[PDB]
Amino acid sequence: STLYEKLGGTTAVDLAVDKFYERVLQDDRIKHFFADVDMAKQRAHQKAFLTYAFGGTDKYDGRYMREAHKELVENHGLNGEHFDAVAEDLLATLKEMGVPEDLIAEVAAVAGAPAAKRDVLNQ
């Protein structure tokens, strides 16, 4: 069920999260959304998105998603391109840690799932 289990333990999860966080930090398309976010929240956010994309959506009610990103949408110009960039960053991270291509496509399908995307984007 858990992220822990699907990736195979604490060290695997830590690797995924740290590499994903590193990549987002360096991605000029989306870095400025985290401008007013301390680095603890920044890393927690990537662990959240990662948790979501591996099928732990349970914690990410669309109504919570809609409120949590409202200021990004209204004041930072958050849009589809940004949303897609975060998913692409995740799939690039997993590939570089040798996650099977069929498993990457599985997480691609959850990461880019339409109803959660509409909620985050306040559409």
Interface positions with ligand HEM (CB under 6 A): 30, 33-34, 37, 41-42, 45, 48-49, 52, 60, 65, 68-69, 72, 82-83, 86, 116, 120
Report the amino acid identity of residue 17.
V
The torsion defined by the Cα of 26, 70, 83 and 60, in degrees rounded to 10, comes to 100
- Which residue, 11 or 33, is less far from ligand HEM as judged by CB? 33
Distance CA(123)–CA(39), nearest Å, equals 28
> Least distance to ligand HEM from the beta carbon of 100, Å?
22
Number of residue whose CB is nearest ligand HEM: 45
Q: With CA atoms as reference, report the closest residue to 67 among 9, 6, 119, 123.
A: 119
- Which residue, 12 or 117, is less far from ligand HEM as judged by CB? 117
- Which residue, 63 or 98, is less far from ligand HEM as judged by CB? 63
- Which residue, 13 or 30, is less far from ligand HEM as judged by CB? 30
Distance CA(84)–CA(104), nearest Å, equals 15
**Tokens for 11?**
């060290």
